[PDB]
Amino acid sequence: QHGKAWITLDAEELREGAVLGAVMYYEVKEGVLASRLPLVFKVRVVETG
Amino acid sequence: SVTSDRTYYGYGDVSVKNEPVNVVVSPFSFPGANASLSSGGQGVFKKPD
Ligand SMILES: [Ca+2]
Ligand SMILES: [Ca+2]
Ligand SMILES: [Ca+2]
Numbered sequence: 001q002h003g004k005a006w007i008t009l010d011a012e013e014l015r016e017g018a019v020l021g022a023v024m025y026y027e028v029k030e031g032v033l034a035s036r037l038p039l040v041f042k043v044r045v046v047e048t049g
Numbered sequence: 050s051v052t053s054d055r056t057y058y059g060y061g062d063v064s065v066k067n068e069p070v071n072v073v074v075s076p077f078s079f080p081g082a083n084a085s086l087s088s089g090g091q092g093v094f095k096k097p098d
């Protein structure tokens with residue numbers, strides 16, 4: 001539902017190597033059987049300094 | 050017997066050779082060396098001479 005994130009990094013977080021892991025909490029709809037479903041996230045750099 | 054035309058002369062010269070100033074330029078290549086300028090970046094660049 002809520003599709004946008006706004007993660008922002010500053011001078012301490014960049015200066016140590018910024019890793020962004022993922023933690024996913026999931027419940028598969030009842031009875032659905034798939035293979036190799038894609039998940040695509042658009043990374044926009046909106047403002048840098 | 051002669052009626053002298055009474056006129057004697059003095060003279061001098063003025064030498065204006067150069068222009069008042071020499072604006073020696075040593076241009077700046079501001080991304081510099083061992084530095085980096087990125088898109089959207091913000092900062093300062095200094096050239097003493
Ligand atoms: Ca921080
Ligand atoms: Ca000159
Ligand atoms: Ca900027």
Ligand SMILES: [Ca+2]
Pocket residue numbers: 049090091092
């Ligand atoms: Ca900067």
